């Protein structure tokens, strides 16, 4: 069984309500179990700045799906979901993104794990240090070190 | 002509030599001028961390290559400079990537400019806030704001 860090993303349509869905969604698959869920942060926009605001989590589970079957079940998720994105870097109502699978590396035709740009992302790296707090990365790098960048981010911690 | 930005990188087979070959493959294009040029930066790989520390820099020119007549040529200095990388997100002798077109948002099979991942990147806007101080981003971010996340950097600032 591995553990395994989803990172949820959202700025249309509901996104508090497209998160609480997504993460629903996630506990209830096969041969997972949702261990925790950082706080919920309303982030400004990466990309155009005239999209809404994002609201972003990261979700830990604990697995004994394969990472391309975990892949497939996000992937379902998001289409059982309605998923639907305006243009690229713009608005979209649910992102759900493998983070880590154990200390996995994975680097194929369909995965990218982990996807090193996203350690750049305060709303993700800020939430991950929430839930996992001295967490050692596939690459060897600490996530103390890592979250330093972000401690002056303005990010709003949501309630709930 | 048309303002545009190139971030350059290398880890392998002499940095600093393989982006002074770069930079002069790139003032010898046909409709294009070379204007300026970053220091270059040492700085930390953004990927595994058991390859060498990157050289970087970012590039001015002025051109009247489209878009993608650019890419080719970028790419055809890649190939005639026999890139060689590893694997992804691994080591490479070089790599060329157009970060801005004038301030145009290109996002097609080929091109994703910008690419607002790489304004996550301290050696790219470190380099570029270099040459350009007063830059206004297509998606209207200043680069006096952008920089600032990168204040603490700790990358090397080469001579000469
Ligand atoms: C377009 C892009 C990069 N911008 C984002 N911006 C923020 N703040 N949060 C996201 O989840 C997010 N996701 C995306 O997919
Ligand atoms: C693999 C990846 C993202 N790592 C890098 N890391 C650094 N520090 N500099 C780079 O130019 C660079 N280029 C790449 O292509």
């Not at 992302?121 to 939430?127: A, D, K, L, N, Q």
């Not at 990365?137 to 960048?149: A, F, G, H």
Request: charge should be negative; proline fraction near 6%; hydrophobic fraction near 40%.
């Amino acid at each position: 069984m591995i553990t395994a860090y989803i990172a949820l993303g959202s700025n249309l349509n509901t996104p508090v309500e497209q998160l609480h869905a997504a993460l629903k969604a996630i506990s209830q698959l096969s041969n997972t179990h949702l261990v925790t869920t950082s706080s919920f942060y309303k982030s400004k926009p990466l990309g155009p700045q005239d999209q809404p605001d994002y609201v972003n989590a990261v979700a830990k589970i604990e697995t004994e799906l394969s990472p391309l079957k975990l892949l497939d079940e996000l992937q379902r998720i998001e289409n059982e979901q309605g998923r639907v994105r305006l243009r690229r870097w713009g608005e979209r109502t649910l992102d759900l993104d493998i983070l880590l699978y154990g200390n996995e590396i994975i680097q194929n035709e369909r995965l990218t794990i982990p996807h090193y740009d996203m350690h750049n992302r305060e709303f993700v790296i800020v939430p991950l240090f929430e839930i996992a707090s001295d967490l050692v990365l596939p690459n060897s790098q600490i996530i103390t070190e890592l979250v330093k960048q972000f401690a002056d981010h303005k990010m709003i911690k949501l309630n709930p």
